[PDB]
Structures are given as C-alpha cells and as structure tokens.
Amino acid sequence: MLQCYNCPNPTADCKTAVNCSSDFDACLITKAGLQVYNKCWKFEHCNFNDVTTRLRENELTYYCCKKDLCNFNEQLEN
Amino acid sequence: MLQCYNCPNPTADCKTAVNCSSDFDACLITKAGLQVYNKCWKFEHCNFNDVTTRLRENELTYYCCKKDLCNFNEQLEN
Amino acid sequence: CAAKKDSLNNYLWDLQYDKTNILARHGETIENKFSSDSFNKNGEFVVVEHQKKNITNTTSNLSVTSANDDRVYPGALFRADKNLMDNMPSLISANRAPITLSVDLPGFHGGESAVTVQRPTKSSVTSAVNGLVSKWNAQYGASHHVAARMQYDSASAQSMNQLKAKFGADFAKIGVPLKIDFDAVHKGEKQTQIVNFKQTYYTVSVDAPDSPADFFAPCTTPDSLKNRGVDNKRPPVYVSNVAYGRSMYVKFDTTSKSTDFQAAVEAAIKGVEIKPNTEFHRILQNTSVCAVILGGSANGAAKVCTGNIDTLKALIQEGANLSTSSPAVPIAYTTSFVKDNEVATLQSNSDYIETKVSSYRNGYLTLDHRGAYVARYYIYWDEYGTEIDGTPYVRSRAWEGNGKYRTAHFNTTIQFKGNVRNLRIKLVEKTGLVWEPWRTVYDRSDLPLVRQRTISNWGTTLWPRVAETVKN
Amino acid sequence: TSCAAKKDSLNNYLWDLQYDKTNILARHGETIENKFSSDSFNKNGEFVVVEHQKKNITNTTSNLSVTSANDDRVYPGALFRADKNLMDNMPSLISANRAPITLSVDLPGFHGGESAVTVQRPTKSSVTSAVNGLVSKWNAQYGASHHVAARMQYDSASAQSMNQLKAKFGADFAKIGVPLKIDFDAVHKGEKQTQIVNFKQTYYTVSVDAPDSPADFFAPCTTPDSLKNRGVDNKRPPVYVSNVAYGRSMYVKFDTTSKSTDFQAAVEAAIKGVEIKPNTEFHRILQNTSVCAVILGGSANGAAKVCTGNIDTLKALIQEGANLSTSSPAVPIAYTTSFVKDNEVATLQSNSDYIETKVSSYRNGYLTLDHRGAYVARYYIYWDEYGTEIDGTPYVRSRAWEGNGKYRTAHFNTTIQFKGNVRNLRIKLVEKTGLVWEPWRTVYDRSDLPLVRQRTISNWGTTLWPRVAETVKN
C-alpha cells in the first residue's frame, strides 16, 4: 500500500525500507533533539501533540508525506 | 463543523444548509440521471463504488470538496 | 386538395438530418495550460492562477429577448439553422393551418384550458393567449394565487466565449448593460458571478397535430417548402411551448480574494441563514449586485448598476409570485422537430482559460521580556503543503531561537507566512531552585494567525506575570 | 619566587569572554520576497508543469571541510578566531607562544598510551609529521591485523542556486563545485532535475586531549594582553581544532531529464543501498540518472575528467574507499573546532533565501473501442479528476464519457483521449440480449484499472455467445 523507511529504534542513518501495513497511510521522519525517527505513520497523527506523545520527545520537528521512501532525513533542516 | 447542503432525499434545488457531524469531512453533490443528491459525506467514500452503492444508483457523476456549502448543483458541469 | 397533402411524412418524414449535430456549436480548441504569479502589493500576498478548461452546455429551454420576441410564440415555425443557434430564429412564412393551444394554470375543466387559433401569427396567438388568461382571472382569479416556479443558471465570469456557451450566443448583447470587466477578473482584481433567473407562472404548449401537413394550409406542396429553404440542411421546427413570467440577468462581483465567494452567492440565492458574524456574512456585505430585467415587452436594461444582496432579495420577492396581473411576459420557449415532435436541444462547446485568486495576510509575533530571571521560548508551527500532483505533506517548524538563554530586556519580532497553522508558544523562567527549576508562565497552543500578537512577561523569580494582546 | 602565577590571569580572561556562541559564527546570504509562479508546456504528449516558490535554507554544522586552500592552517591543535575567515572556511592562525599538546588517533588495536603522541610546539608540519608517524606505526604493528571500514556520512541537497548550496556545503562551494558544471537555468526551466551530494568516508580521527586549563595551549608567562592585542576578545573569541577526520571525500552530481517526482527519494534510496528494484518503481529513474563525481585529494588527483557515469559508477567509487589499503593516504577531509573558553564544540549557522523549482508531468493515454459483434452494445465509462484549490484544499469531480449509454451497432470503432492525471478509470460494455425493458447482458466489467499509453477492448461473437479481449501496451 505504501513503502517507507521504518526503523523501530532511533538511528541517525535509517536505511531499512518496508511495505507499510494497511493500518498506515502516511510516513513520518522526526528530529527530536539529537534523535531521529523514521517509521510508517498515520496522517491523522501528523500533529505536534501526537508525535510528541507517541515518541516521548518533549521538543521536536517532524515531517509527513505519502510518497514511497519520502521520509528521508534530508527532508528536515536539522 | 463543516457546513454542507444536506437533503435526505433527492431534489432539484436543495436549500437546507446544515453543520455536518464531526466524522463528515467532505461535501457531496451527485447527479444520477435526473435525480440530484446533496449530502454530508466522507472523502474516503468519494468513490464511484461507494457513491453508487449507498445511493442505489448505477449511472452518475459526483463532486466532493472540503469547503462550506461547496456542494451546489452548478459545480457538476453535467 | 388531398394526395397533394403529402408534404407530410413523404417530404417531411424523409428529411435526413442528425438531430444532435444540426444544432451544435463548437469553439476553437486550446491546449492544456497552467500558470500562476503572486503580487505582494498590500500587506497581503495574493496569487492568480490561470487554467485551461471546457464548458459543454446542452439546453432545450431557450431565452426570449427583444430581438427575437417578435418571432417567438407558441406554434411558430422555424428552420433549425444558424439563426436559431444564435437565438434569432427566422420565421417560416406559409399559409398556416389552425392550431390548438393549452395552458397550465390551476382549475380549468376538460377543454377550458385550451384555445384554437385559426391563423397562427405573433399578433393572433398573443391575443389568443391574453384572452385565455383574460378569464382564468375571472373564473379562478380569486380562487387561486399562482406562485412562480423559480429556475436559475449560475456561472463564473471568465470569458465571453464561455459565457455565450453557458447563456446563449447572443449573450454579448445582453451582457453590455452588465459592465463585465473581465480584465479585472483576469488580473485577479475582481471576482464576478452571472446568474440568469426565470420565474415561471404558466406555460402555453402546442397540441401536436395529427400529421406534419397539419401545420400548413391545404394544397401546400413539398416544392413550396423546397423554395423557402426548408430542407435537409435546414429542417423545420415549431415552438412546442412558451414560459410566461419574469426573467433577469444579475451580476454579482466583489474585490475580495476569498475563495468562498461563489458558495456565498449561491447560498444567498437560496435564502439561507448566512449568520451575523460568519465569513459568508462579511463576503455578501461587500458584494456588488447588478440586475437587468428582460422578457418580451422590450427588456428595459437598468440605469447605473448600484445594488447589493438586498436589492436581489426584493426583486425575487417582487417577481416571484404574481405581479400586477401582468403576464408578466414570455421568458422562455422550447422547440420540437416537425418530423417526430421531439424536443430539439442546442449544444454548446467551448474551451476557455479560467482565472482563480487567493490571498493570505502575514502575521507578526513580538516577544518583550521585561522581567527579571532568565527567559526561554519554545515556539513551533506546522506548514500544510501540497506538491505538484496534489499530494499532501506536513512540515513542522521550530523558532530559530528556541530555548536560548535570554537575559535582561529582550525584545524581538517574528514574521509568519499567512498559511502557517497550529502555532505553539511556551514560555519558561529560570528560578535558581530545585523543585520546579524552570516554572511555566505561558503555555498556549492552537493559536490563531492574527495580524499582530504581543506577549508581555514581567515579574520576579517567585511570581512571574504575563499579559497577551492581539490586533486585526 | 616570580612567574607562573599569572597563568591565573590568562585563565580569567579566557573564561570571562562574553559572546553569543551562535550569532558569533552565523552567516547570512541574500534575501528574497515571497514570489510564487507556475508555467507549463506540452512536449509532444507529456504535460509538464514547473512551479517556482521562494524558500529558505538554514544549516548548522560543526564538521567543516578540509580543502587545498585551508589545509595549510588546519591541523589538530591549531588556534583560530571565530571570525569571518573561519566562516568562509579560510581560517587564519593565532600566532602565540604555544605549549606542548597531546594528540590521539582512534585506530583499532593499540594499548593505553600507545595511540597518543606529544608534539612540542605544534605547527602544521610538526603536527602533520606527528600524525604520519602514528599511522606509520599502526600500519606496521596492526596493518596486517586489523581491517578498518570507514564510517560514511553524506549530505544531500537539490541544486537550485549557488547561494543555497554554499549555505549547505560551505562558503567555498563555488570553486569546489565548478568541476561538476552545474546548470541552474536548466533546473528552473524544468529541463533537468539535479542532486548534489557530499560523501565523506572517514577511516580514523586525530583528536586533541583535554587541555585541563584554557591557560596553556600557550607559553608559561603569556599575559592575557598578548591576546587582547591581536584581536582575541569577545568580539572574536578563540577556538581550537579539537579533531581532524582523515579519509576520502568526494562531491557527486546526480541529474536526469526525467520530469518525475520521486527523483530525490530514488537517488537517496540508491545511496542507502536498498533493493532499488522490484525492476520498475524507482528503477526507471535510475537508468536515466547521470552521475558526475569529483574526488578531492592533493596530487591534482584529476577531476574525474569530463564527468560521466551512472549509479553503478557511484557504487564502485564507494566500495573502493570502504577500507584502508594501508598504503593510501592520510588525507584530512574534515575538521572540528571547539571554543577555548569551555571546550564546547562550535557550530556554524548558514542560511540563505532562494527560489526552488519543482517539476511534474503526465503523459496522456488512449482508449480504443472496437465492437464487431452480432448485437447492440452500449458503453459506460467513468473516471475521477482530482484537484487542489489554489490553497491546498482537495476536491474530486467524476466524469462520464459523452458517448456512454448510446446504442452501438454493426462495426463501431473509436479512440478516446485521457489526460494523464485522470484516476480510477471505469469501463462497462453490456449487450442487448432480449427486449427493451429486459436487462442488458454484461460483457466486460472492470474498474480501478491503471492508465496505460494504449488500451483497446475488442468485442465480437453473437448475442448468445459474446466474446471480448484486452491488450494493454508499453
């Protein structure tokens, strides 16, 4: 349904791509302080409050999209 | 709340504006033959299969949008 | 005469034409095109979008006007030629046979709703219709109040070519009293909407004769029609019925850049809430209205187009429902082919370049830290976006000076794009202390992108104070 | 009985420097107003849209590039001012009487104290020789043994303007990047899409030890006025090269004439490895991606030459420098500076406004209907037209083939044109099998089927035994 970078743990260089499940329709890449997340996501949860709570990161910047392997780290200014 | 013309049965000129329930994020106007429906809708059901199935029609065009009272009849060229 | 009575289904049945092209208009084509540009004139930004599109309009109900009123009456005969497609049909003169007419109107029994005109002429059929109305207002005038059946067609004003396809090839001469700027629409300086209203009281329809000969006097020969142009290239039609009432063209326009304009105009037509402080109210409160009223009589134009959404509502109520017993005139007519008595349809097809407009207003946030202690800000916001292709994306942002150890009198102003969303501001304060070593003083979210926003914090390390101001 | 002591005074001067460690090393490019433009053209089929909009790039990094121009003044233990020269990647040394300094190298093997060396009075040649002496000792004792793989890091950016790339890759990117012969006018016209990527392969890092006290670095009786005069103050604080990375560095230009989105994701996916295939998706973009790579060294290495290659050219250049051939240099590729006051790593902020151009295209398709069946047939064809309003609000408007429920007799043939952006194409045929009021008999009912360059649906046979076929193309 959609292909995106999904690393179950924060890593500066997420390189593993997976065909996300039906449950997921969008993709997320976030930079919380010094940690970087990449995973299949739901567009309805592409808000500050949801990403903050679901990743346990007080301060962050995030990006959401719906194209294959779009959520690479160079999409956020850093 | 999204505002949308919603008439429970087909009519030529639907005039009853209503605040759509929270789950409704779209506005539907569809011309099936000579019947015209105006309803609060869901963008995920703005689909030939979903529209025909739920209105008991086999031949139609439809228009969906996200703005207030956008589903007026002149929106479909027909 | 007889046997000679075979102009009917012998010359008028063997007529060869394609019912759906003989009355079809096409315009020269435009290849797909897309274009945009932005102003940045006011404090506003403004974007103008040009896009190629097509209008295909097929209607059978044709408009009555001054230039054609003399030729439009029930039972009249036309050729399905270029004159009809220009809404200026040419009469087929000929020694006509008697024809029967009928009228809606409530009441009437058996055949009292019908009348027979011996020599169909504009003058003669008119007097025949007036006489049939001259008396329903006698047996039933007091027994019934006849309402109007409202019908209208709306279209954005983009080009003359697309307006002709929407309203008729003769629209240029109807839309002169309407001072359509067009140039102002193409430059994004104006939005305009054209609406044609038709309030129908009653319609006079023709009783389909037994045979196509029934239409012409006896001893009318095929050659007699093959000499007045009636043929395969220009087959004949007759006015099936004619709607009586009041009609007008209305120009809605505004200098607003709001994208809810069309939806607000149409909501005003329909008589809806549009409530004190909603956005539809504020749009309609600045919409210029410009009406020119027509019909048979001789149109009449207007004067200087000065009106508002209220002028509209009065005319509706003034034309809706019966007028001063007036007809109030013929407003529409429908034609049918002599062969099979089926309703003819006119088809219009035109490409055009549409113009769309949009604008947002930049906002400013000023942070004045005139208080003790070390302040600290955490500001975020989301950028809703769409690539080419229409695919959505969300890119969140963070203030350059997020979490910087401020100090004494700190002041700064932040500039936000108008399309920013979900603004977020948190202010903390260093209190040299374990337990709550930072202490929140201001923590608000889902802020509104206002023109100006000022957040003034002061106080001490033990009781920081803070105030907030807005401005539009 | 006299001097020393005053080491206290120098320590207080360096500790009490007051600067904003961010804006002290921040760079700012040109400014531009919020412009938004779009235009289009029609290469044979292919409807191409180019859209320009004003963006901003902000970059913060502490990993500065080593070049031929600054190699003279970049060594572990060098002192600079956090001034304009450093921001331009041409730092100037602070001349002063220095103290010995201890360097360390992070190579595998070694014992405690073995991987470090002291340099009496560090200078460019004294530190370089010291480094070359440690690697030479490691290669002899553990070269045969340990095989070291480079930690690789890459920074990507779309080629849009020389100013935004200078903000991404350094104030001296121009000069460094003219060998890749970038064509900006071609990008903004939608003729090309281009990606610029800096690859850094680090074999090992030479680092400086904790100085214990910011006084020293310098001689014993140094007096803080010696620095005050020379321009070392809170307007231009002191920094030191805390470490220098050694290995292999190169710049790579990816460009294609494809008007496709997903280009950035395709190039980034290839760089990351990943089965870029399923021999279709990104596969087609990467068969059309030219690769131009210039490698940086010191012996005039070359320039690549005239530049030409593909993703397989890239992947070979990567795997050639994945390990030390314990015979290749020993080229510094990057260096990091830290503030003398608190030994905190210093970061350089660079930002610049620029207009980015994006491109998208769709190739219109054709549908052919051939009805050669002994029976009457009709067609029912629908499709969806998606769109976003001027803002970004989406909408969808369904359509119907003008010649839908029309009777088709004997031999009926026609082809239909479709914009490449239509979605969810639908097709139904049905044939007259009985009387008018009896339901038609459905031949061929298909939905949600892709838009190809050519689709032709032929139907034949007789009313009681109808037949139909589908072909697709390219």
From Swiss-Prot, chains A, B:
Residue positions bearing lipid (GPI-anchor amidated asparagine): 78
Domain UPAR/Ly6 residue range list: 2-78
Membrane topology classification: Lipid-anchor; GPI-anchor
Entry superkingdom: Eukaryota
Effect on the protein of changing residue 48 to E: Almost complete loss of function. Lysis
MF GO annotations: complement binding
Modification comment: N- and O-glycosylated. The N-glycosylation mainly consists of a family of biantennary complex-type structures with and without lactosamine extensions and outer arm fucose residues. Also significant amounts of triantennary complexes (22%). Variable sialylation also present in the Asn-19 oligosaccharide. The predominant O-glycans are mono-sialylated forms of the disaccharide, Gal-beta-1,3GalNAc, and their sites of attachment are probably on Thr-52 and Thr-53. Glycated. Glycation is found in diabetic subjects, but only at minimal levels in nondiabetic subjects. Glycated CD59 lacks MAC-inhibitory function and confers to vascular complications of diabetes.
Glycan attachment positions: 19, 42, 52-53
Key word Cell membrane present: yes
rRNA-binding is among the record's keywords: no
Gene Ontology terms describing biological process: blood coagulation; cell surface receptor signaling pathway; negative regulation of activation of membrane attack complex; regulation of complement activation; regulation of complement-dependent cytotoxicity
Subcellular location: Cell membrane; Secreted
Keywords: Cell membrane, Disease variant, Disulfide bond, Glycation, Glycoprotein, GPI-anchor, Hereditary hemolytic anemia, Lipoprotein, Membrane, Secreted, Signal
Annotated Gene Ontology cellular component terms: cell surface; endoplasmic reticulum membrane; endoplasmic reticulum-Golgi intermediate compartment membrane; ER to Golgi transport vesicle membrane; external side of plasma membrane; extracellular exosome; extracellular space; focal adhesion
Effect of residue 42 to D: No loss of function
Cystine pairs: 4-27, 7-14, 20-40, 46-64, 65-70
Chief site of localization: membrane
Subunit structure: Interacts with T-cell surface antigen CD2.
Function: Potent inhibitor of the complement membrane attack complex (MAC) action, which protects human cells from damage during complement activation. Acts by binding to the beta-haipins of C8 (C8A and C8B) components of the assembling MAC, forming an intermolecular beta-sheet that prevents incorporation of the multiple copies of C9 required for complete formation of the osmolytic pore. The soluble form from urine retains its specific complement binding activity, but exhibits greatly reduced ability to inhibit complement membrane attack complex (MAC) assembly on cell membranes.
Associated clinical condition: Hemolytic anemia, CD59-mediated, with or without polyneuropathy: An autosomal recessive disorder characterized by infantile onset of chronic hemolysis and a relapsing-remitting polyneuropathy, often exacerbated by infection, and manifested as hypotonia, limb muscle weakness, and hyporeflexia.
Full protein name: CD59 glycoprotein
Underlying gene: CD59
Shown part of the complete sequence: 26 to 102 of 128
